[PDB]
Amino acid sequence: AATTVNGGTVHFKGEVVNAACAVDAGSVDQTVQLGQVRTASLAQEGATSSAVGFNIQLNDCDTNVASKAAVAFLGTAIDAGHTNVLALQSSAAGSATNVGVQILDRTGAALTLDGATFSSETTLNNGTNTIPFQARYFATGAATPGAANADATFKVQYQ
Amino acid sequence: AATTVNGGTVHFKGEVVNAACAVDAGSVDQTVQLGQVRTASLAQEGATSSAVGFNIQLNDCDTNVASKAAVAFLGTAIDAGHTNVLALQSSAAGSATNVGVQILDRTGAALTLDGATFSSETTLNNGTNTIPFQARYFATGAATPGAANADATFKVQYQ
Amino acid sequence: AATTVNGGTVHFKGEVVNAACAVDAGSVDQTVQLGQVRTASLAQEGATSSAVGFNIQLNDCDTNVASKAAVAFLGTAIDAGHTNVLALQSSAAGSATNVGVQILDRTGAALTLDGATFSSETTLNNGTNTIPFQARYFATGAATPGAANADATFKVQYQ
Amino acid sequence: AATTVNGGTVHFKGEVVNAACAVDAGSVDQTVQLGQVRTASLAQEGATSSAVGFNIQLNDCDTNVASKAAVAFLGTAIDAGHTNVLALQSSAAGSATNVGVQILDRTGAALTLDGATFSSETTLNNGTNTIPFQARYFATGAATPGAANADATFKVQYQ
Amino acid sequence: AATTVNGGTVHFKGEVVNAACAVDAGSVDQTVQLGQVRTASLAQEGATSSAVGFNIQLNDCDTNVASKAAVAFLGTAIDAGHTNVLALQSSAAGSATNVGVQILDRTGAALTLDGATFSSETTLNNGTNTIPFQARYFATGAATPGAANADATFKVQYQ
Amino acid sequence: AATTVNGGTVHFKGEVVNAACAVDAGSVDQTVQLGQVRTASLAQEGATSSAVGFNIQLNDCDTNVASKAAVAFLGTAIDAGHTNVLALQSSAAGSATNVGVQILDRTGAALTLDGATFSSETTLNNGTNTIPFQARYFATGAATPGAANADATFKVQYQ
Amino acid sequence: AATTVNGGTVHFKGEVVNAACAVDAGSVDQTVQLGQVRTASLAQEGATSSAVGFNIQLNDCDTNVASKAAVAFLGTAIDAGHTNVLALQSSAAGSATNVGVQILDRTGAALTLDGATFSSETTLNNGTNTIPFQARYFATGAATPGAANADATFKVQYQ
Amino acid sequence: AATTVNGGTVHFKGEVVNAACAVDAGSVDQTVQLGQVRTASLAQEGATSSAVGFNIQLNDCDTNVASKAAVAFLGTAIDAGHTNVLALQSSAAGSATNVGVQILDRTGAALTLDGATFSSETTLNNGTNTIPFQARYFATGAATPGAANADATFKVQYQ
Amino acid sequence: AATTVNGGTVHFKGEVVNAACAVDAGSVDQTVQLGQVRTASLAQEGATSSAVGFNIQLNDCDTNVASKAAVAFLGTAIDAGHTNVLALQSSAAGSATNVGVQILDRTGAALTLDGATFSSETTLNNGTNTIPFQARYFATGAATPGAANADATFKVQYQ
Amino acid sequence: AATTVNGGTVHFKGEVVNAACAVDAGSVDQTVQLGQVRTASLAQEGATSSAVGFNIQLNDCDTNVASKAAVAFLGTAIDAGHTNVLALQSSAAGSATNVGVQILDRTGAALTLDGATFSSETTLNNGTNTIPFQARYFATGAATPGAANADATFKVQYQ
């Protein structure tokens, strides 16, 4: 007849914020696939790859509370002279060298990765808003092959 | 020649059940991302957020053994007045207050988290079935900001 | 010489059914775009928007095995009083309230989303068949603006 | 007799808006095929390609609520000097350089891609309206070959 | 007063080429409807259907750069014995067997689908040029009924 | 010398049928423009518009296999009391209400849209045949203005 | 005996209007072939080609509801200084430069393409009415060769 | 004033290669929907299904470095007698038995899944190239119903 | 002023190897979720479950040092007659009986769990490599319900 | 009746601090898997492996008490000349020699391990903050193989 068995476990992740908007579930933790890049494209300091787009979706926006939103990213910089270039990290072996990841805001400029220098402000509408961003590779030398993964956290400022 | 090195470890997790179906490997321990919710949407007792879907997939179902499946959820309720509201838990500091997680079955009704009140039955077909569920935030008063993680186990009943 | 590099990954999804027909690859996981709807069109209980069509294609149909096909849909209903209205789900913030998605079969009637009430039967021919459906918005009260995404699974019955 | 098998999944996308018009399902997410452009046409700063037309269809318009509509586009600018030139993005390799995409409104003028500077207002009629736009390539230098894809979001202002 | 709502997304597709001509936007991604064909017309190896025409349009052609163009097609061949016959592909079920698609160039000869054997050259005029092609069904045996869809990419050589 | 560039893609669509005839390429996916209709000609239940013709062309007919052909249509009917009236569908907003599309066979009678009630048979000749049909608007009440688009698939029966 | 096969699809396009007339099916979406024009005919600002006539047909007109009809056209103007000259569009390469398309009403004057400046009113009669227009090329400088396609929408005002 | 809240995390994935081409971001990790297949089509050893196409896109190709590309696939074989048939894997219950996935290269031959046997070579152009492949189901016996998901990695060889 | 508090502890784990490759951080200690399995699928000696895939990723591979890699697994065998069946272990109570875990290499054969019988060799590319494996349940008799957790270590051999 | 048995013991670990933030429970005692590293990478003094990221999560932050946080790490340095290289420790036998673990702050610089030299200050927001760090291997000579585990203790400074 009726059979009951142990099923499993569910974990719920989320955050309550006091802010004019709320970040969408699909934007709080997202993966941006950059694909591959040739070393010939990163052969000296300052070379950059092509860009890949990624968005931060804000939901439930209330323009009476704030009309503008900006984003600031925080992560490990590749070195002291490249504070806007995000260092690679996956494993102790096999990462590309002399390459980092740059995050560009909607003005096309790379963002400083100190978690305190915000992107250019974007006017909000009520409800859903989408903040565009780009990610690319930046060479701090003659790039050598390997995995090129990186991580950053972001915070949103509402004015 | 052949150089051999120690490589690492693999842990296998699973369960053998005497039941008409088996829970899919992706459903036995899943994370549901709710995203953010504004405190302005949880400003008083009984206010609820928007919903996020999640599923429990059953595999290898044999309807000659059982024609219907139901799910019961078990977790720590927020208080004895709200038995269908899951208390938040991630750390001793920084969680939201006056907010819990509610799990709704396919009828849209919040489920009691006592591990014994089963959801509305769903008719099974042979092979794969997908039992739908929703999660949302439920305010037990005026919500304050903070992390809003929660956990629950579930069991499956077959009739 | 031959330069070999790591390329990437490919995931294959599919299913083997014992049935007179097989659901087409483009029908197993389809997105239906509804567009926007004005709140003024969903201003009170029972108001419905305009409809959007979507099809379920069946391939390799063998009418010697089954002459008819029907579809049942399973999803989270908006509440217990509206069992043919799909609840909205994208994120914990920013969804429309008092609105759900209704799925209509080829008779124009909304389908119960219990995964067991099958649509009106359609006569099959050998080879390809196209079962038509419509999706519309159903207002359960005075609708408020926001995102209006929803999901549902379906099963096919052959007679 | 009757055989029931697992079918698939349907995803519904849409939005409820409080506005004088609703954006048509075929305009909320559309692809504009620009075709090819020769580097000889984009050999210096300020060179532009030929234009390609695309529309934004507004449905169910209510001239009593608002009589004019305008569109503002938001995306990543190619650089601070060209705030009306959309930067290219598909992948980390193989995009054209020194080229971006310009969006022109019905007066022939390129729109600033800040999400805040709206196009020239267009008088609405009741029901269906079609806002015309053009897209073209803009060279910020001597263009090099590659994939020229770009994305932008848009918001509609009703007055 | 002005009410502003979130509109939608626009995706732009294109390519910058260093070539004498540029492929027209209507020709970079086109659908060729072949219609139906009877198995009676495809009843043994080497049987062919009637042909459907399709063109590739080249814009902005500068004969001072190249006076001739040719097209090579790349796709999956049906087997090793028919390298000029495109394999069918739509879905894991319901396709015709013993049939493929042949692409004839302007001389009536079926093209090899290796992406390296170019069609017979066509003389270019300045401006717009239209390269004719045909597609037909080719039977590798007694053909059986089913969907018959196929895909192929093409490249253009300028001489 | 030869400059080779990537050109684009071609998709081929078609079907192999085991039948006395084959539907023409221009008749498998056709758009019937009905034009405009005044609400004043659709002011009450049962009011019909003027008709527009459309044909389904059958090719390669062999009357030794079948002498007669008939067409059945399938779509979403406007309601359960109006099984011969096709429902409108383009977008969640902006469609006409209380109006549907009626398809008439060569006797001038409206066809049931269940995909199973075939039209009156038409005697075939060898080779090309042209089955005539009409489409008109049918008012199920007092029609309101808006878009009136609709969709139907058809099947052909040979006897 | 009887064999049934999948036939195809039919799309119905149309509109329900609350107006004194209804636009004919042959005029809602028509192509106007202008032919060719020599660059010698368009060698400086203000030069115009010869005219090509096109009509908008109004059916079922009810003179009791309205006696006059006028038309307004909407499209992308070539630039700010020529608001009555339609900018060209087919593709990113190979369009004529310094040329646009002008639309003249029955008084011979070019219409402003803002969707709001209506043509000269024409007295209606009951039943069918034909509203004459002309299209011509207008040079905004020394024309250069290339494709010269353009599109516009129109709305009809009844008084 | 300015309220700042914790936003979320972004994960960047990519790879720097010393190669003539770079694999496109949409091809490093792609899902191939095969759709359903009937057991009737897979009823004995050697029976195959219909094919689904998929591509591997190579970007920024430099034919002065390599004129040709080939692809090798690595995965778990179904058994020792079928090294070109990919074993199914999603979960410990509910997979189809006696079925695997075959990957065919552009010649129609199934590839050996040892990550060392390369597909037939394809001639490259500068810039974007699209290597075609197909996937299909292969029966090693009388296939039984169930889920049929499979995975393979691939490497690219340049010559 | 500056408040300083005791924060916590960080434990770093890793291994320096003299080898051609280095095992990836995500592959030195990974968990493999098998999901549930029914006793009905394990009702006699030699019955197996469906498989779940898992990979061992090798980083920073230098093919000049070694061209092939193989993996050997070591754990507790279920008994003397089944040296390729890993025994279950979690706790003194509640484990399934007559079931163990089987690890298959890329040829689909089950591996002997003695840390000395290596899987079939896989050809390496420079940089990142992914060795595929599968895990399934194996029945040594009529399986009984309970937890089914198992552990194995592995070594890598480079040739 | 009711059987009562001795169950077990629960140990509770935590800390009360007087500070603007509180360290998250998952950050007070965390393991960082570095993976393997080849000796060929650490072949002389000053060689470094690739990096692995680890975070210190601060909960419940109150920016009115302090707006900046910094971290200082304490552990046994490898020798007097390398005060920013953490000595390895797990057991009296089998550790790697000439290698240690380096901890890098968000500026990319290695942190001195005296417990008193704090990383670069990071601006906080209210609630949850995440301080990014990286860990890598550093060679103080020709590295030799063996286990490479290390432990460090950290303290947080709030200004």
From Swiss-Prot, chains A, B, C, D, E, F, G, H, I, J:
GO CC annotation terms, alphabetical: pilus
Cell location: Fimbrium
Disulfide bonds: 21-61
Record flagged with keyword Membrane: no
Main location (coarse class): other
Domain of life according to the entry: Bacteria
GO BP terms, alphabetized: cell adhesion; cell adhesion involved in single-species biofilm formation
InterPro entries on file: Adhesion_dom_fimbrial, Adhesion_dom_fimbrial_sf, Adhesion_dom_sf, Bact_Fimbrial_Adh_Pro
Keywords: Disulfide bond, Fimbrium, Signal
GO molecular function, one term: identical protein binding
Gene3D superfamilies according to UniProt: Fimbrial-type adhesion domain
Alphabetical list of Pfam families matching this protein: Fimbrial (PF00419)
Family of this protein: Belongs to the fimbrial protein family.
NCBIfam families hit by this protein: PRK15194.1 (NF011741)
Described function: Fimbriae (also called pili), polar filaments radiating from the surface of the bacterium to a length of 0.5-1.5 micrometers and numbering 100-300 per cell, enable bacteria to colonize the epithelium of specific host organs.
Name under which the protein is recorded: Type-1 fimbrial protein, A chain
Organism this protein belongs to: Escherichia coli (strain K12)
Gene: fimA
